[PDB]
Design brief:
The PDB classes it as transferase. Keywords: transferase, riboflavin kinase domain, ATP-binding, nucleotide-binding. The assembly is monomeric. Crystal structure of the riboflavin kinase module of FAD synthetase from Corynebacterium ammoniagenes in complex with FMN and ADP(P 21 21 21). By secondary structure, this protein is α+β, with helices and mostly antiparallel strands. It contains two helices and seven strands; from the N terminus they run βαβββββαβ. It has a single domain, classed as Riboflavin kinase-like (Elongation Factor Tu (Ef-tu), domain 3, Beta Barrel). The chain is 20% helix and 31% strand. Strands 1, 2, 3, 4, 5, 6 and 7 form a seven-stranded mixed beta sheet that branches. The longest helix has 25 residues. The protein binds flavin mononucleotide, adenosine-5'-diphosphate (ADP), magnesium ion and zinc ion. Magnesium ion binds next to loops. Flavin mononucleotide binds next to helix 1, strand 4, strand 5 and helix 2.
Length: 151
């Protein structure tokens, strides 16, 4: 899969608290190759580290993630981000170097008229992501210790 690596950094502060979908934000210079803006199913891995990870994620495990690439046009954000909602987990990822692999495209990035409309679609994105990643596990015969995909 195409992938990017970089530290998880601070965004607008709205994902978890306003939308109920915390996103681990990464920002890249405009020279770095990314997939098209859009929503993706993929895997987020905390790279090997001696830094302690607070919460229920550990290094070197591929966690199922629903991923956004773009400028969050519903909100009118100013920089392109890669943003990963890690399914069914809760950890403090700020400052940790992570790898994000883009496995499947789910849909185009969209400017919604309201947060309600966006959340309705994000629920479907997450459901699709579960299904698509389950297929990926089978396609690569991934060893259970190496990934996390709840239910
Ligand atoms: C699966 C998924 C789908 C998303 N789809 C869209 C979208 O269609 N349009 C949009 O403007 N933002 C989209 N986003 C981005 C959210 O707007 C963004 O994660 C949220 O505003 C939190 O921003 P923050 O991390 O800077 O706090 C999506 C995020 C995720 C995780
Ligand atoms: N399931 C999860 N997926 C992504 N980030 C999570 C998750 N659980 C906790 N977090 C933490 O929440 C932060 C993202 O929340 P968010 O509201 O999007 O803040 P920000 O605007 O700073 O990105 C991450 O950087 C990470 O530290
Ligand atoms: Mg975020
Ligand atoms: Zn694959």
């Amino acid at each position: 899969h195409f992938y990017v690596t970089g530290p998880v950094v601070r965004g607008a502060g709205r994902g978890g608290k306003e939308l109920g979908f915390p996103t681990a934000n990464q920002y890249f210079h405009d020279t770095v190759a990314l997939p098209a803006d859009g929503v993706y199913a993929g895997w987020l891995t905390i790279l090997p580290t001696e830094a302690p990870v607070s919460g229920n994620m550990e290094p070197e495990v591929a966690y199922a993630a629903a991923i956004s690439v773009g400028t969050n046009p519903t909100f009118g954000d100013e920089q392109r981000s890669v943003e990963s909602f890690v399914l069914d987990r809760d950890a403090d990822l700020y400052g940790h170097d992570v790898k994000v692999e883009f496995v499947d495209h789910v849909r185009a990035m969209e400017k919604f008229d309201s947060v309600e409309q966006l959340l309705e679609v994000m629920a479907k994105d997450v459901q699709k992501t579960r299904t698509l990643l389950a297929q990926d596990v089978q396609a690569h015969k991934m060893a259970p210790e190496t990934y996390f995909l709840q239910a």
